[PDB]
Amino acid sequence: TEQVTGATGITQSTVTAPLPEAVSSLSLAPTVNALDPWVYLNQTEVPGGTFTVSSATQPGSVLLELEISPELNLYTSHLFRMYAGWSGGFSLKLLVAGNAFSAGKLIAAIIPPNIEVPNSAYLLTGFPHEILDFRTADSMEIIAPDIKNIDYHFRGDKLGKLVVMVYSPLRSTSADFEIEIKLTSAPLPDFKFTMLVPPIQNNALPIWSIPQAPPYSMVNPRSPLTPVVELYINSSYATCNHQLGRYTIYQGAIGNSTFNPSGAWTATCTAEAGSVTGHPNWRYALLDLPDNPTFDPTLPPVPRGFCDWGSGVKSGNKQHLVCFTGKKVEGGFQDVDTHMWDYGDNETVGLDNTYQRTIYIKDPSLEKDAQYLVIPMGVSGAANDDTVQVAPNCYGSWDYAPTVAPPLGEQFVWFRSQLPASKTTTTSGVNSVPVNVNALMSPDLMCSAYASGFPLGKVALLDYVLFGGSVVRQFKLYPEGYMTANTTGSNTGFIIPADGYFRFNSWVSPSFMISSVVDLNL
Amino acid sequence: VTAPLPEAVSSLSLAPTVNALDPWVYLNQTEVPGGTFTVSSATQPGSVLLELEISPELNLYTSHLFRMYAGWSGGFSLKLLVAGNAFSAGKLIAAIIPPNIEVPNSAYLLTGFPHEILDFRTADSMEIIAPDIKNIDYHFRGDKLGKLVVMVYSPLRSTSADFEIEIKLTSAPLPDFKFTMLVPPIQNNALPIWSIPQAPPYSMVNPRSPLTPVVELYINSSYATCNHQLGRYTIYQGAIGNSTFNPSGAWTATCTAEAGSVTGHPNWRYALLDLPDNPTFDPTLPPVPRGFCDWGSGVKSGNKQHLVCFTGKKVEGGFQDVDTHMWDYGDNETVGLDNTYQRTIYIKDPSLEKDAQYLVIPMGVSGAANDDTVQVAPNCYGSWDYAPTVAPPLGEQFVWFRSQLPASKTTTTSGVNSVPVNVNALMSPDLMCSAYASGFPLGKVALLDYVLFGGSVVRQFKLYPEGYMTANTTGSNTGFIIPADGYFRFNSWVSPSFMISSVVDLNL
Amino acid sequence: GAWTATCTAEAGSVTGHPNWRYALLDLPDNPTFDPTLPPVPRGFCDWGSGVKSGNKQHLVCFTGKKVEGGFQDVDTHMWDYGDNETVGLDNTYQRTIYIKDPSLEKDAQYLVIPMGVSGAANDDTVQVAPNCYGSWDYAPTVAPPLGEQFVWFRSQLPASKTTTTSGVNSVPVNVNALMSPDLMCSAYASGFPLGKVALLDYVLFGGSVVRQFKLYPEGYMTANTTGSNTGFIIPADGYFRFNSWVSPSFMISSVVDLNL
Amino acid sequence: TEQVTGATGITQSTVTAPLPEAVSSLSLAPTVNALDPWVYLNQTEVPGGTFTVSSATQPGSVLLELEISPELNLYTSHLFRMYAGWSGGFSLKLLVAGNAFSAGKLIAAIIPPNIEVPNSAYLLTGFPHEILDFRTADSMEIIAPDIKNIDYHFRGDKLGKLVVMVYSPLRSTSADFEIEIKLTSAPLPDFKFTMLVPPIQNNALPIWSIPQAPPYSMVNPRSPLTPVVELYINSSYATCNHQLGRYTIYQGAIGNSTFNPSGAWTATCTAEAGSVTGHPNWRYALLDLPDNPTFDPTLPPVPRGFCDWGSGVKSGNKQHLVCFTGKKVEGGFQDVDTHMWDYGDNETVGLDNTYQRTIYIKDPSLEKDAQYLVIPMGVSGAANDDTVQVAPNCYGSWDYAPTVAPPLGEQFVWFRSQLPASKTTTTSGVNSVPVNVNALMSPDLMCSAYASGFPLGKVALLDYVLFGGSVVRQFKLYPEGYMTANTTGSNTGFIIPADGYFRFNSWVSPSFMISSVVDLNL
Amino acid sequence: EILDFRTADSMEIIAPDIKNIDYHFRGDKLGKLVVMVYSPLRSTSADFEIEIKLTSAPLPDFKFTMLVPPIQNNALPIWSIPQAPPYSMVNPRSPLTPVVELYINSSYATCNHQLGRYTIYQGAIGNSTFNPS
């Protein structure tokens, strides 16, 4: 069908099925559960279906990739949580923003299941497909068939994918009119469910309901016992090699990450003899691991969720970590006092800043092979926020969290925590300096995330309401744990408030660029 | 096509009295109150531009009749007008929202609802019938209502025009639409038409600076946000904070004046404001007397910043030897007290009597204080529902009621010399007059025409329910002025997101 | 806003009791002294304390020499209207006014804050506004229809006496205003039916006690009163509410006993 | 109906009647005079029907306002002069300039009679109406009905109005393409006249024929006996408070304005005793008013059309007015001689510069209560063109002409007159200085205006032909008397020639802005 | 409907059941019947209170539904008081002393007692108890 615009211009509401539909008989299905007709009639936006194509996007890179599955339409996905088996295709719609002054083509091809998706103008046309002009636009209705060899799917079956790619780049220099694409779908008339079953499955919940709580209520994994004073963003902090604050939906807490940071914040050491030749006698001590009684590489080499300060790579007499320390005694501990301690030993690499039992202790009179408390508390010496930020190098094979960096153009938003500075009037020899701690992610959000497991291949785009809805920033939360925001400026000290009320916006693809922009320089 | 969901004529048999309407009301078409919004490339995707409800408010004729009637039924034939251009890129999807049903943030989900779409480029408006979804034979007053939600089916990719598009909605009750239960024409619902009496702003009063006529209107980018108390008013909540409908009466005040001296620098003496309105210093009622003062000259300036005041010892019959005296708020040397809202204040008089009421007339300001300093109202923190600090939506600036404050100098050694300054009042009770007279449609903004030269020049301002007016400004300047000729006039109801078509060049 | 005012303060000497000097009110609203526009600045004052009292009756005022930026030495000063010794000028509306200050500069603007009264002046004396005659369509004098009395907005004016020899001491008195702009607010908002008087109910004790008043289009409010008293007062609790449109001849069913 | 443009673009010739037509039976009409069919077929431009809408015009302000009456179409109006009663509607056409690159809507609503016309996008849609797009344009044919409660109108009946307003503002930044709107009309087939009557009525003549005469032939009311040396324009001369040169079509000559300025230029005074304390003894004198023998406020306080120089507000020994003066004697006057005279007295305000009998006279030996001639002649002292321009302040209740200022953007064009300077070689004590006089309007034009009374609510747009048609300026003549031109520059000394040949262009609304522009700076 | 005091004949006004719903449950919002003095007693020659009684009867269409056991929290239309002399009643202020008589005193303008106070809705108020003894 075709229609003219308000005046001039021409827009086509194309409908076609690039690949024929082979409706299954559902004979093997024990019971073919029907479905509400108004669901077929109604259309919904596919998760991650909103991809924007500008004149800068390279031609050939795929912008959208959807598995033909009940997850496409919200209603069908929610029902699929009720049922067990599903069948039938989907009527996907491509809503395009056509102006008749733009110039370019997009191509939508249905990739069969178990077939790799290529990304190039060439080499992608082979698949059954359709080409949409940007000047025509308006709702190319793709009848995405249900490519099947079994009569109806069970959970986990590999599924065909619809992929949209820039067929011909946008070039019309009408002053950078980007084209936004919305994709919607709904079950085809042939779609049917089967085998009703209690509604608890592995489905990612179609909408993840964010508990309306503020960040300052959240705990700081790297700095428990310290409220999250504000959310924070820095350009310099490219990567994050932390092991205490790191959680993911799939693998759970990683490395030293724990869901009770305050609970595990404490640790103990055996205080083995010997010391390095530093001006203050730094007696060695080995952290005792309740979970690793038999020291082996596959488990962590330090107590779960112990410490992540990692002040200096070669910190000698300039930087230190300060901690309460007391000798274990009947009941509790003996005269617990603050002391300047360090990871491993400065004298040797691989131990200067790593994760191992061996650690410096300021206490000159540290008893040989006596259990000693250690509370990392804070930092002293010449440390600063960035020196704290760099976590110690973790090595071995103890499933430690790999260091990660945000996608180009985005930056890691952190849960900034203000660390009080403890200073002694008497000559205890130790004076913690004011410092701050940044946490990649807090377990509180991750709890609701685990409840509403992310849909595979999608990314939680959470918009952060700050001033009662007047100001709404947008942070992209990745399933790996880190949260990122699209930033244009280049500043290290830019701040975000801690008003709260995180809310779920929609499911977007990792490549998706946040429409909202945070000017760090501003 | 035109009707995504066919209307279900209700038999109304349950209605005690079927109140028909003039057929010509159905025949005629007209724009709807508040059904005006601006869509622009700067708009955020997935953000509902506008939300309505199938209700007699859609048609102004139907609303006017609704003031007479208690019950009503039927949908609304709605026609959507687009101020589009050829360069425009995008489509609009309007999805009728049955009551109790939530609205998805995505157009791909809005498509499921009974909807209908046009193109920005096409000129002929599209007609969408928005049926009334009823679970009862007819609809009483105050019940939940199905919503009409307009969403940009496609945002502005080309954006070659780079100027927003105006949308206006027209509605018509369906032939099946019927009223019932005739009642006296007095309803809490907002009147479709707001009639603003012609009163020049100078004819209005300045809450911040009584006794000084509003000399002009002011615009300033520097004054990004408003934290004032006296000026603020609200259509719904009435007066907020210290603000009162009589700034003149509340201007006077007094303090018990306990015999105490300043601690950091004992050149001043401490006095506590009595609270006739608040019998006891409660954390919920205002800490300062109703409508007293919000100069906030000093932030930490113990001496350089000072407020003037006519002060006198209280005696039988009246006060004593009322003389100018310079004063401050709380403890200048104290954090949380140098500039806050509480009883303690500075007093210049070296001699202050132990617990004697002193007249307090804030009068004016002294020292190095300036307009910028006074514009910053004292920071007040507590649990007495202080008036919240507000700022205009991005792209719009506050318009204030500028007032001129005369200076006062003394040759004799009274030690007080009031520096000349200006004052800015957020809103006027004289405009709240007609505001309260005619209610605001919920979640809608009044668009006011301000006429200066007998109609030759008009400035359009948005007046929000919160009580603050804004103007679209392309430029950025600090000292921009607007005359006080007057003749405020109501234009239309617009959504808060609406952008004023007219623009004001501040750099001019 | 109109309360403040200024006078050119020309070099004129008082007659009768010396030590006072004449001053002319400047007319920012009225550029030039005209027989049609008001002779005094808009909304200046109408105290009219004295009728022929050269010294017994007087008005207080905060006055200061006008200079760049602002006024100078704003101090209380005793003042009056026109020529207290002159018939047709003692109590009228003309730029000429008494000034207590012995030192008045030749043609310098002075701040004029009418503030309050002084001397023998009392509430009755202030209640009599100065007689104004001319062609400037001054507000006509009005009286209530027989059997009804005006209801006024009483206000309290604090006194002020000085220990230092400033020579000015304000006597405490009250003030009565015929109508309030805060009520004319809604009056203008909703016009009056032609030739009809609004009958409004005034509620004092949360509805326990009500008082019916008529609000005439001329601005004055009246109440039917069987008794006759001078000092009768009514609480200011509030809650004015419109009852019904009535003809001017209407007699309020409710009655207020003044002797009570 | 619809039609495409030369290529692309789309234009609609809409026809519709927003309000139904109720044709009267004309039963009560004694005789229903028919009307020439070709008049119905033919279309004409309505007076004031050419209103231009640009992207700067505020949305909401009404641009056009036409009473549905025979005055709309020229032919019908001229016939209506022949007849007595009229009936029937009109087919109004909206000719729009649509480009398909513009963007905006205008709204035309038929206001019923005796109903106030509002001006706002909202609050105006209630009336029966139609919305025209600027991209479609081309002749929306509005069938303006004849809203009647009487079967056929008599003269003076209130009539419904068609009002056109900016429904949606023009914004298309195609480099300031303003849109010009022409409105034309013609009687509907039902239109009929009745009761033929001799053709002399109160109708404004449909076209006002300007007598082809030059300004220098015109007289200068403020300075008779002095030819109008040129037409003149000044930025500084904002308002005009003159009482000698002021005429209007409706109320006739106002204040001291007279149709024989030269005839009344003379006056006489009684020369009452007393003088002010100025260095030269300025004897007082009271002007005798033939029309005001009993001095009363309602009539003027000075002789009709006496004097308007008004040199100085506080002119003492620096400025004066000079006039021939002679003592009345048997026959004529005794030794009439020039003398420096003044309005009222400098010593007092309200008399310094006002209109009253009392006036200064230079003559030291001015006889008490002796009639004396006064001929204002010219000016002396330190006067200049602008000091002369300011007329004296007029006060009282003698129906004096109110001071007026032009609409914003326009300026008062004047009839500049060059005043010869009389200088005495002998010590007569008086020396007139060269000066000029500006006149708001001359009675000569107003004579033809009275003949062709202006249509109510319209303004005479007269184009001034100067160089034989090569140069044609445009001056808007308001019925109040003043003539104005749209000026862009800001200069006080800009001049217009006195070639002549004023010609009538068309009837425009007061809000109308002259298309032609005069650059004062140029 | 409007009635005049002077007339003795009763005026019948039908009080319709305004329903936005098929039928009412217990506790729903209901249309109110309001009686107001249309014109005041300006004459006041009587100066005595005029008593008003209201009588009602269900309209023919009036109908019930959903039979249920007869127990509801609503107040009974008729209140039955056992015949008990006040001296047979107990005095909270002074137990052990029978209520000798009922007392009126103009001087006792207001009551500030705690023990005596009782409330139908709130039961005992302040120190008051159902067993003063």
Author numbering:
A (entry chain C), D (entry chain C): 6 to 527
B (entry chain B): 20 to 527
C (entry chain A): 268 to 527
E (entry chain A): 135 to 267
Give the authors' words:
Tulane virus (TV) has emerged as a crucial surrogate for HuNoVs due to its close resemblance in amino acid composition and the availability of a robust cell culture system. The structure of TV reveals the characteristic T = 3 icosahedral lattice comprising 90 dimers of the capsid protein VP1. VP1 subunits further divide into two domains: the shell domain (S domain), constituting the inner spherical shell of the virus capsid, and the protruding domain (P domain), further divided into the P1 and P2 sub-domains. In this study, we introduce, through cryo-electron microscopy (cryo-EM), the structure of a specific TV variant (the 9-6-17 TV) that has notably lost its ability to bind to its receptor, B-type HBGA—a finding confirmed using an enzyme-linked immunosorbent assay (ELISA).
To investigate the structural variation in the 9-6-TV, we collected three cryo-EM datasets of the purified 9-6-17 TV. The first dataset that we collected for 9-6-17 TV has inverted image contrast whereby the virus particle is brighter than the background. We reasoned that this was likely caused by the residue iodixanol (OptiPrep) in the buffer not being fully dialyzed away. Despite the reverse contrast, the reconstruction was performed as normal, and the map contrast can be easily inverted by multiplying −1 with the map voxel values. In the end, a 3.2 Å resolution map was generated and the atomic model was derived from it. When we examined the density map of the 9-6-17 TV, we found a density bridge connecting the two subunits of A/B and C/C dimers at the position of Cys452. This density is consistent with the Cys452-Cys452 disulfide bond within all the dimers. A band at around a 120 kDa molecular weight, the mass of a VP1 dimer, was observed in the sample without DTT but not in the sample with DTT. This indicates that the Cys452-Cys452 disulfide bond covalently linked the A/B or C/C subunits in a dimer. Additionally, two mutations (I451M and R452C) are positioned at the interface of the P dimer, contributing to the stabilization of the P dimer through the formation of a disulfide bond. As confirmed by the results of ELISA, it has lost its binding to the original TV host cell receptor, B-type HBGA.
